Design a protein around this ligand. Structure first.
Ligand SMILES: Nc1ncnc2c1ncn2[C@@H]1O[C@H](COP(=O)(O)OP(=O)(O)O)[C@@H](O)[C@H]1O
Ligand SMILES: [Mn+2]
Length: 451
RNA sequence: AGACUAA
């Protein structure tokens, strides 16, 4: 038994058995991250188990550190700074960090216990990680615990909460607004507002500030200096991307959720390419996670969730299912086994197995294009499997006529390392490297030979 | 688009 949000003395021996995958399917705010996880970790240390803890984002990682503070844990994330002796048997890192380590030339510890928090995360690295973890369990090499309020197959956008939630459907502005949305600024409590992009977040946040509102902007770019500020009394609005979709304990009163996002889609009609489709409705699991940011305080009973529109459950055309398989086909078990996708996430798209297997230098190039080149999984796969080296940027110019990249209606020119002037016309098109002007600048640096 | 950047 336990009290005071403190960990339970009693932990089930069942969850530590090899060949055992435990799905902890508990509602938002039940105590997965900050009460259950510490109990498991303390009991893992006593059992002397080589242990891996996985967070989807740095927001979840920071939440974990608060609960795990004092324990001999090795943090492998910029989100947390702590002294490490080097003899820690418990490692903590993000989902994508682990997949990266699995794809790189050196070698993950042989964990016999793996705890993945937010085991529904649809980021391609997270899906591939679940594939690895579930084969390790199947082989009898590890015990694993998957913690999530929205396990695969979740259709309920309004799950159980610690406190009653007032669900309100209203129109929500995507852009700045002069007028017509007084309900946003008339509210007295603290609001968490989910935006599909940092661009949209910028022009919504400066719109709120000119109304004398204290606004914190959260994303991958501002996390470091800004997340400690949410752990304060000095804010009205948190305008956040999906970095805060999971795990966050903002201690707020309201979530504004437009329930929209841009989705990468692989197009198969004609030459294969990636587009950014949408904005389209988010999944029921995303809506449920976002709503899960509030109604967490049993002493605070009038929290609000303001949303717009229905969710869209069908995401089979989302590129993350192909890309997860592109990664997992190149990940190997120490025994030699390529892992298969976690049960519930199989046949989201037409497999077939080992289709994305890369050889020798191609697998290294594949990883290098993602980690050093900052290119998406699909694009990196296409370049690597064509036998192109990481530093060979020819493919950025040899695309068919229709692949010519435009910026402000003008044909993009690249000046190369050697002073050639060439039109940006890549052989493979991925809208993620050209849609946003900031993304395109980075891709222009890549095409130059300067990345 | 968003997330991750470890050894
Ligand atoms: N720093 C804190 N101070 C007070 N309460 C907290 C703090 N962090 C989390 N909580 C509360 O503890 C409960 C469980 O938190 P958590 O473990 O994050 O739940 P879950 O991971 O299942 O969403 C929630 O009610 C949450 O609001
Ligand atoms: Mn949690």
């Amino acid at each position: 038994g336990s009290a005071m949000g403190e960990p339970d003395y009693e932990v089930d021996e069942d969850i530590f058995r090899k060949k055992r995958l435990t799905i902890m399917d508990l509602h938002p705010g039940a105590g997965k991250t900050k009460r259950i996880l510490p109990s498991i970790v303390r009991e893992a240390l006593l059992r002397r188990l080589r242990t891996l803890i996985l967070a989807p984002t740095r927001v979840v990682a920071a939440e974990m550190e608060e609960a795990l503070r004092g324990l001999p844990i090795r943090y492998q994330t910029p989100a947390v700074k702590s002294d490490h002796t080097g003899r820690e048997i418990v490692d903590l890192m993000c989902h994508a960090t682990f997949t990266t380590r699995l794809l790189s030339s050196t070698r993950v510890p042989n964990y016999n216990l793996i705890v993945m928090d937010e085991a529904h995360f649809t980021d391609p690295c997270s899906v591939a990680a679940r594939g690895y973890i579930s084969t390790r369990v199947e082989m009898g090499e590890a015990a694993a615990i998957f913690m999530t309020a929205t396990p695969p197959g979740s259709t309920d956008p309004f799950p159980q909460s610690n406190s009653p939630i007032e669900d309100i459907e209203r129109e929500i502005p995507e852009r700045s607004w002069n007028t017509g949305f007084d309900w946003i600024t008339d509210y007295q409590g603290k609001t968490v507002w989910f935006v599909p992009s940092i661009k949209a977040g910028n022009d919504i946040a400066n719109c709120l500030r000119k109304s004398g509102k204290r606004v914190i902007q959260l994303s991958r770019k501002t996390f470091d200096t800004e997340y400690p500020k949410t752990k304060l009394t000095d804010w009205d609005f948190v305008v956040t991307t999906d970095i805060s979709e999971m795990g966050a304990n903002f201690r707020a009163g309201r979530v504004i959720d437009p329930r929209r996002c841009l989705k990468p889609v692989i197009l198969t009609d004609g030459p294969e390419r990636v587009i950014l489709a949408g904005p389209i409705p988010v999944t029921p699991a995303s809506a449920a996670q976002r709503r899960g940011r509030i109604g967490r305080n049993p002493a605070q009973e009038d929290d609000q969730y303001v949303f717009s529109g229905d969710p869209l459950k069908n995401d089979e055309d989302h590129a993350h299912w192909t890309e997860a398989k592109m990664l997992l086909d190149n990940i190997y078990t120490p025994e030699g086994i390529i892992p298969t996708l976690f049960g519930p996430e199989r046949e989201k798209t037409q497999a077939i197995d080992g289709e994305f297997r890369l050889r020798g230098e191609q697998r290294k190039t594949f990883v290098e294009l993602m980690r050093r080149g900052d290119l998406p999984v699909w694009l990196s796969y296409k370049v690597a499997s064509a036998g192109i080296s990481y530093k060979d940027r020819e493919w950025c110019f040899t695309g068919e006529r229709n692949n010519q990249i435009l910026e402000e209606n003008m044909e993009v020119e690249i000046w190369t390392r050697e002073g050639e002037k060439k039109k940006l016309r890549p052989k493979w098109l991925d809208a993620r490297v050209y849609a946003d002007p900031m993304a395109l600048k980075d891709f222009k640096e890549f095409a130059s030979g300067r990345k």
